Amino acid sequence: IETVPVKLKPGMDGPKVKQWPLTEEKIKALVEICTEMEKEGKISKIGPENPYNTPVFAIKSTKWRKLVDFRELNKRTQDFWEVQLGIPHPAGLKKKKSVTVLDVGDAYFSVPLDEDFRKYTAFTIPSINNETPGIRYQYNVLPQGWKGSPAIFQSSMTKILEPFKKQNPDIVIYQYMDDLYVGSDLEIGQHRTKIEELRQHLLRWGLTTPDYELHPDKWTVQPIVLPEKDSWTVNDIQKLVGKLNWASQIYPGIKVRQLSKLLRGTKALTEVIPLTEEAELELAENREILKEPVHGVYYDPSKDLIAEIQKQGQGQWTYQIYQEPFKNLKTGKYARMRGAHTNDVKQLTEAVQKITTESIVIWGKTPKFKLPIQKETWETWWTEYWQATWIPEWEFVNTPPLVKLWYQ
Amino acid sequence: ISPIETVPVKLKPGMDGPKVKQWPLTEEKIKALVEICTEMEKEGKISKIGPENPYNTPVFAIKKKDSTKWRKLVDFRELNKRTQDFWEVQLGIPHPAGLKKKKSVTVLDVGDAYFSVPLDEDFRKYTAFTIPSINNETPGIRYQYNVLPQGWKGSPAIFQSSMTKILEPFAAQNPDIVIYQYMDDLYVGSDLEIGQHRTKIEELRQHLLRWGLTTPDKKHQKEPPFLWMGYELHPDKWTVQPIVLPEKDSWTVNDIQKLVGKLNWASQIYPGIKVRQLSKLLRGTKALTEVIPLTEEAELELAENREILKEPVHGVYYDPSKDLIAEIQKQGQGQWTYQIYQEPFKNLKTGKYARMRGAHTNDVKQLTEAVQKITTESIVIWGKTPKFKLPIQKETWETWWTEYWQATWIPEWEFVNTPPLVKLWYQLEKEPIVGAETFYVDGAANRETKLGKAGYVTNKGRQKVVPLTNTTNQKTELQAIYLALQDSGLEVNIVTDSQYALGIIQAQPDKSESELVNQIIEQLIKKEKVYLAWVPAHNEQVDKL
Numbered sequence: 001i002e003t004v005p006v007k008l009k010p011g012m013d014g015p016k017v018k019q020w021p022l023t024e025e026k027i028k029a030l031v032e033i034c035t036e037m038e039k040e041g042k043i044s045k046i047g048p049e050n051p052y053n054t055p056v057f058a059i060k061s062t063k064w065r066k067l068v069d070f071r072e073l074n075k076r077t078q079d080f081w082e083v084q085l086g087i088p089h090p091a092g093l094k095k096k097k098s099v100t101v102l103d104v105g106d107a108y109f110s111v112p113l114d115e116d117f118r119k120y121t122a123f124t125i126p127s128i129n130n131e132t133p134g135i136r137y138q139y140n141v142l143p144q145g146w147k148g149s150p151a152i153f154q155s156s157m158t159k160i161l162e163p164f165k166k167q168n169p170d171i172v173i174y175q176y177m178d179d180l181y182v183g184s185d186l187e188i189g190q191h192r193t194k195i196e197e198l199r200q201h202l203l204r205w206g207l208t209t210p211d212y213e214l215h216p217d218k219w220t221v222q223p224i225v226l227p228e229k230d231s232w233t234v235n236d237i238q239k240l241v242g243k244l245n246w247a248s249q250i251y252p253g254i255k256v257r258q259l260s261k262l263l264r265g266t267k268a269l270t271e272v273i274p275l276t277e278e279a280e281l282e283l284a285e286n287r288e289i290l291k292e293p294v295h296g297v298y299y300d301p302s303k304d305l306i307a308e309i310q311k312q313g314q315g316q317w318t319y320q321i322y323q324e325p326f327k328n329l330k331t332g333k334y335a336r337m338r339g340a341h342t343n344d345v346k347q348l349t350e351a352v353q354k355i356t357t358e359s360i361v362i363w364g365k366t367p368k369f370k371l372p373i374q375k376e377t378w379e380t381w382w383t384e385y386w387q388a389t390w391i392p393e394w395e396f397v398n399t400p401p402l403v404k405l406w407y408q
Numbered sequence: 409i410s411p412i413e414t415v416p417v418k419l420k421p422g423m424d425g426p427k428v429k430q431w432p433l434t435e436e437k438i439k440a441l442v443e444i445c446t447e448m449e450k451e452g453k454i455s456k457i458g459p460e461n462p463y464n465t466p467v468f469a470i471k472k473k474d475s476t477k478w479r480k481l482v483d484f485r486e487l488n489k490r491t492q493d494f495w496e497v498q499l500g501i502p503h504p505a506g507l508k509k510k511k512s513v514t515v516l517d518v519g520d521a522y523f524s525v526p527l528d529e530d531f532r533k534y535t536a537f538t539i540p541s542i543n544n545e546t547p548g549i550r551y552q553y554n555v556l557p558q559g560w561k562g563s564p565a566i567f568q569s570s571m572t573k574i575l576e577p578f579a580a581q582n583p584d585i586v587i588y589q590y591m592d593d594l595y596v597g598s599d600l601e602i603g604q605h606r607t608k609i610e611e612l613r614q615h616l617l618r619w620g621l622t623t624p625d626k627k628h629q630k631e632p633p634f635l636w637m638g639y640e641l642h643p644d645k646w647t648v649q650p651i652v653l654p655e656k657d658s659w660t661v662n663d664i665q666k667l668v669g670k671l672n673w674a675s676q677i678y679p680g681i682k683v684r685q686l687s688k689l690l691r692g693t694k695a696l697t698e699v700i701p702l703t704e705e706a707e708l709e710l711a712e713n714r715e716i717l718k719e720p721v722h723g724v725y726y727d728p729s730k731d732l733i734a735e736i737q738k739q740g741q742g743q744w745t746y747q748i749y750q751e752p753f754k755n756l757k758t759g760k761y762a763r764m765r766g767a768h769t770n771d772v773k774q775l776t777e778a779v780q781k782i783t784t785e786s787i788v789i790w791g792k793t794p795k796f797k798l799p800i801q802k803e804t805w806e807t808w809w810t811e812y813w814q815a816t817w818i819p820e821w822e823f824v825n826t827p828p829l830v831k832l833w834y835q836l837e838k839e840p841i842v843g844a845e846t847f848y849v850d851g852a853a854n855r856e857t858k859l860g861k862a863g864y865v866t867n868k869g870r871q872k873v874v875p876l877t878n879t880t881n882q883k884t885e886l887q888a889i890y891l892a893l894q895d896s897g898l899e900v901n902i903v904t905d906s907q908y909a910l911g912i913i914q915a916q917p918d919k920s921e922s923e924l925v926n927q928i929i930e931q932l933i934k935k936e937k938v939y940l941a942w943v944p945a946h947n948e949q950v951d952k953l
Contacts, residue, residue, distance in 0.1 A: 016493075018499075021784075022787070022791075023791050023792055024790075024791030024792060025792075027791065046495075047415050047495075047569055048495040048565035048568070049415050049416055049417060049418075049492070049494065049495075050495060051493035051496070053495075128506070128790065129502045129506035129788065129790070129791075130501055130502045130788075131502050131506075131588050132588065132589065133498055133568060133572060133589065136495065235839075235840045235941055238903075239941075245944055266848060266865055266866070266867050266947075267846070267867055268845075268867040269841075269846050269901045269903075269939070270843075271867075311814070343817060344816055344817060348815045373814050373815045374776075374777070374780065376780050376781075377780055377816065380780070380783060380784060380787070381817050400813040400814075400911070400915075402911055402914065402942070
């Protein structure tokens with residue numbers, strides 16, 4: 001098998017991202033892994049004549065896995081390799097009643113990587129206390145985590161999958177970087193049986209796959225609705241008017257002036273202003289407008305997806321995925337159900353993963369996150385709960401939402 | 409040179425090699441240059457090729473070590489600009505608190521290191537230089553390099569990997585001895601009976617010499633304690649080489665920079681050093697040598713540092729069998745101090761955290777930030793994270809992090825009862841207060857007029873308006889809340905159309921670089937119950953316009 005040649009975007013230079021420091025445990029795990037991989041031909045030590053680097057990490061699902069962070073190489077090459085070798089994203093996958101996610105990254109490691117390109121997969125096992133130079137490798141085979149890998153392999157993957165796709169014309173199969181998403185409208189039992197059939201079929205053709213079934217029938221944009229009380233106060237009216245005014249940014253037909261006239265004289269917060277018929281008119285019309293979806297909300301495929309997350313206490317989190325402000329493409333809520341077995345960063349990591357999975361199933365792209373967390377904290381601990389082969393882009397917000405329960 | 413395998417070096421893509429002018433120099437300089445040049449050609453460091461090479465780099469001749477011995481050196485700027493990049497020569501240095509006591513330590517400085525490593529052949533043509541005789545009216549002689557030239561872009565990294573490869577065989581035959589590398593030095597540690605350690609040092613020396621690398625054959629190592637990168641490394645302790653703090657009347661920008669630098673450098677092993685008021689001065693303007701008068705606070709800080717500093721303090725080395733503790737104390741004005749130790753009599757090291765960003769800061773959020781900075785530092789230095797000793801109650805912390813808008817991780821930590829304890833000094837109500845007066849506050853200013861007003865109207869019919877000079881919309885927005893607090897009982901509901909004020913106050917800050925906000929803090933601490941609610945503008949806001 002000869003190598004698919006990989007010409008980067010013209011003028012692009014290779015990744016030069018510094019390596020993060022790791023604990024001793026994870027450095028030893030990386031040393032083990034890489035010594036095995038060098039033994040198997042998959043990587044090779046490199047000289048100082050190679051100036052590139054790309055971070056590595058050790059994650060876990062009981063022994064250590066190595067995770068390369070190829071985000072820079074991805075932008076630097078595959079923005080030409082979503083073009084030259086793109087994988088079309090099936091708009092039908094999102095509609096299937098069940099979708100299972102199979103890891104098939106182990107395939108790539110059989111395929112040699114183009115000679116002239118290997119230099120850019122360089123990584124460094126770091127060393128504690130700067131005591132020794134750091135161990136320097138580059139890949140001789142298609143690396144997991146690189147977007148070029150499944151692009152190069154998709155011919156092989158299409159062939160391997162053809163018999164199953166003939167036998168099963170309704171099952172949807174989409175390959176994003178290291179996983180197949182397999183969607184069916186079967187009973188969970190029949191669906192799991194057919195997933196196992198695909199597993200054994202992949203194995204009959206020599207694809208190992210290890211060994212948790214998501215359902216995209218959720219509501220697209222969860223509609224937020226004002227509280228329903230059997231008694232209203234001045235401050236209840238004030239929160240209600242405030243929450244209705246902020247929605248005016250999204251549904252512009254928010255008709256609230258009967259409520260502003262309902263709290264007209266300077267009253268104590270605890271006083272209960274009665275429900276005017278004008279007031280109940282405004283309130284019912286506004287609930288009605290809240291039931292309907294937004295207008296003009298579409299998915300611009302030229303642009304990037306943007307996700308925002310808000311912590312809600314008691315282990316609850318809310319998120320919105322949008323491309324322009326207030327034109328939400330999807331909204332949801334995550335809740336980790338484990339008392340003292342989960343903490344904030346565990347929850348945020350699991351939520352970021354769930355949002356990225358949803359985003360893939362729905363659009364084939366991943367979103368850039370606006371994470372509510374101190375940059376250095378996340379940089380230190382995000383690996384401790386990360387169970388995914390890919391890594392979304394992200395950034396860190398420092399202004400808090402003064403709008404918390406405006407989302408839930 | 410050496411039988412070492414060269415590393416292939418190519419020029420930057422689509423670049424040619426240097427073709428730079430060689431203006432003639434002093435005849436004396438040319439003479440000394442030819443002397444040393446032909447002497448190092450005899451040693452194979454350089455060769456002489458005249459005819460076909462179109463490249464050229466300039467040479468200079470000076471006398472910095474006047475041993476009746478001049479020195480040639482080459483301005484490799486235009487060549488360096490055209491050679492490829494390399495693997496970044498190791499950025500950073502090992503900190504002494506992460507070193508482990510080895511029963512014996514030797515330091516070996518490698519002599520004329522770069523000139524003993526060969527240069528990739530097909531690249532040598534790009535190091536060519538020339539020597540003229542008489543104003544170029546008679547031709548000159550042209551040389552090129554066979555080894556890593558002094559101060560060329562690839563020299564240090566290529567040297568480092570050559571050295572690593574030469575070490576590998578000895579390291580394989582000697583697992584019990586440990587060799588760390590730095591620019592020209594080897595640091596060899598062992599826990600062997602001293603005679604064995606000396607025999608091993610001579611074995612390593614002969615190894616290196618057989619690879620072409622000379623090493624001090626004397627009672628080589630400048631003995632312990634070692635003066636290393638601004639450090640004193642003692643057999644069982646480390647500290648910083650002494651720091652002289654000058655006494656001067658006037659102070660320049662450069663001198664305050666040097667002082668703040670020496671102080672922060674000292675702060676890694678001397679506990680209690682502060683630099684808040686010293687660096688406040690430089691943070692003023694971007695002036696480069698402006699004569700900045702010293703202030704009163706800066707001078708007390710300098711006195712206190714001077715009193716910490718005239719007495720010696722040391723650190724211990726790391727023992728991986730004994731666990732790792734970090735303890736944190738507060739100082740004041742967002743300054744925090746900490747110690748990393750394994751036993752409470754001697755520290756591995758010390759350090760300070762300064763709340764730099766955020767004019768509306770919080771004690772608990774800052775403490776978190778300090779735990780973070782320490783955690784990163786320990787992952788770097790020791791490869792694990794400390795167990796923390798923290799002056800905060802568990803109920804305090806669990807209350808804070810559960811209500812805070814960000815997600816925050818809190819490693820294994822134990823409360824310490826040392827003051828000044830870290831607490832939260834007030835908490836707004838979650839819901840309005842029955843039987844408590846409601847204050848519709850608002851305030852206003854004019855951008856160009858710079859005059860403003862601030863006031864309130866209450867459900868009891870109480871109204872106040874107060875005028876203010878040189879204020880902003882935001883400052884009067886906070887002043888209106890301050891009025892409501894001043895004029896209210898121990899339970900007060902407050903209503904503002906200023907999302908900025910709600911943002912400030914809801915951040916539960918403990919101190920500010922703003923007198924007004926500190927007065928609001930003292931009021932909120934004084935008040936028993938305060939619910940603060942927000943509404944938008946367009947109430948009482950129109951009466952204070």
